[PDB]
Each structure stands twice: as C-alpha cells, then as structure tokens.
Design a protein around this motif. Structure first.
Motif, PDB file in Angstrom:
ATOM      1  N   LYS A 137       0.425  -1.362   0.056  1.00 43.38           N
ATOM      2  CA  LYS A 137      -0.049   0.212   0.127  1.00 43.38           C
ATOM      3  C   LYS A 137       0.520   0.883   0.165  1.00 43.38           C
ATOM      4  N   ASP A 141      -1.895   5.761  -4.382  1.00 42.89           N
ATOM      5  CA  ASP A 141      -2.613   4.262  -5.154  1.00 42.89           C
ATOM      6  C   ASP A 141      -3.496   3.416  -4.119  1.00 42.89           C
ATOM      7  N   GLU A 142      -3.783   2.178  -4.341  1.00 43.68           N
ATOM      8  CA  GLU A 142      -4.491   1.314  -4.024  1.00 43.68           C
ATOM      9  C   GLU A 142      -3.438  -0.273  -3.353  1.00 43.68           C
ATOM     10  N   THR A 158      -6.058  -6.243  -7.346  1.00 40.37           N
ATOM     11  CA  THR A 158      -6.360  -5.284  -5.438  1.00 40.37           C
ATOM     12  C   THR A 158      -6.625  -6.195  -4.859  1.00 40.37           C
TER      13      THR A 158
END
Ligand SMILES: Oc1ccc(-c2n[nH]c(=S)n2-c2ccccc2F)c(O)c1
Length: 208
Positions: A137, A141-142, A158
């Motif tokens: 993480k 970003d995700e 993801t």
C-alpha cells in the motif's frame, strides 16, 4: 487477476536462485529487512518536507511474523509501499541491469550472498520460499497483492483483504525443508548476525 511474464533476465535470476546448490540460505532475511529499511527511509525522507505523508501511519517499524501452521514467515514494514507500476516494474528495482551485473560477478568469483549489492536482493526470498506473496500500500494508490511461485510468471490483483494503511507485507510460503526459519532462536540469531545496525525497531512475534 492479471498474469504477467517475468522479463527473461529476472526468470533466469529466479531459476539460478532456485536451482543452484548454496547452503547459506539465511541471507534472504537480511535482504528483505534491508529492502524494508530502504522503504522506511523513503517515507521518512518524504515526511521531512510533507508531514501529511505519515497520515497513513506514523510508526516506522519492521515485524517478523512466523506461522508454523501456515508454514509462512511474514516480513511487514510500514515503509513507503509500492504502486501497481512499481510492483509490475520488478518490485521497484532496476532488476534487468541488476541481474546482468550480478550474473557477471558470479562468473568472476562472487557468491549468491552478494545479491543485495546488485539491487535484486528481493529474489533471494526464493532460496527458502516455494511461493512469495507481496501485499503493498502506497499513499498514491490502492492496496495490491503480487504473487509468484516462480515458473516465469507473477500475478497482480487489487487486495480486498485487511487494509494496512501504508507499507509492504512479504509472505514467504516456505519450502518443506526450510521450516528452521519459523523457529524463534534461528530468526533471532539471523537478525543479530546480519541486521544489527538497522535504524528501525524489528519485532520478532512469538506463537501460541
Ligand atoms: O521486501 C520488500 C521489497 C520492496 C519494498 C518496498 N516498498 N517500497 C519500496 S520503494 N520498496 C523497495 C525497497 C527496496 C528496493 C526496491 C523497492 F521497491 C519493501 O518495503 C520490502
């Protein structure tokens, strides 16, 4: 789930790590801790000019989590983390030129323990792991899950798992004959030998 091919040089590096007879396997821990330390220096550096970079967590640390039931050794850091592009890009390394300089050194007389001097120390995880999962993480970003059992490919997805805030989690799914790296006294001995001057707290978790 996106599946990608490793660049040829990285697949070769991984194959060399997996298939070469080399007993000094414990170096994988020093290499992963050193990467964690560099990721922590990166977020600390950014935080010097932008304190809000630490909004995703102020603690800068390294956790070593053995799990005998799952046969996994997890290295967690609260470093800068990695974007999807970093993850695809050989986990933030210059792995193609790094692999060439490493393999040229091995022919000259160097040994696998010098891997970190070529910026590709992450791949030493395959000295002990049959599968590596990287949960990461980054602030920009995700949360993503990178995974490879070597064999020329890696996946990226993801991560809908436990949110981490910021940092990287390296889950080593250990080979059947490499369970000594789940033992408290063995991890402690390695940390003391190869990582005594890391500038962040290293917490070795214990089990039930
Ligand atoms: O085992 C790892 C592997 C990578 C990271 C990581 N997270 N963010 C950044 S930058 N790195 C990073 C560190 C050193 C070299 C290249 C990198 F991409 C980590 O924290 C632990």
């Amino acid at each position: 789930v996106e599946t990608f091919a490793f660049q040829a040089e990285i697949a070769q590096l991984m194959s060399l790590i997996i298939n070469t007879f080399y007993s000094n396997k414990e170096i994988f821990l020093r290499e992963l801790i050193s990467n964690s330390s560099d990721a922590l220096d990166k977020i600390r550096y950014e935080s010097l000019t932008d304190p809000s970079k630490l909004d995703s967590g102020k603690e800068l640390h390294i956790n070593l989590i053995p799990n005998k039931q799952d046969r996994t050794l997890t290295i967690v850091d609260t470093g800068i983390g990695m974007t999807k592009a970093d993850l695809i890009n050989n986990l933030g390394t210059i792995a193609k030129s790094g692999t060439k300089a490493f393999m040229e050194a091995l022919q000259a007389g160097a040994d696998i323990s010098m891997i970190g001097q070529f910026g590709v120390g992450f791949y030493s995880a395959y000295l002990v792991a049959e599968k590596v999962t990287v949960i990461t993480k980054h602030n920009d970003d995700e949360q993503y899950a990178w995974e490879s059992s070597a064999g020329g490919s890696f996946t990226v997805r993801t991560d809908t798992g436990e949110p981490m805030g910021r940092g990287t989690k390296v889950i080593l799914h250990l080979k059947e004959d490499q369970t000594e790296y789940l033992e408290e006294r063995r991890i402690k001995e390695i940390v003391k030998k190869h990582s005594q001057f890391i500038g962040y707290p290293i917490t070795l978790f214990v089990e039930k």
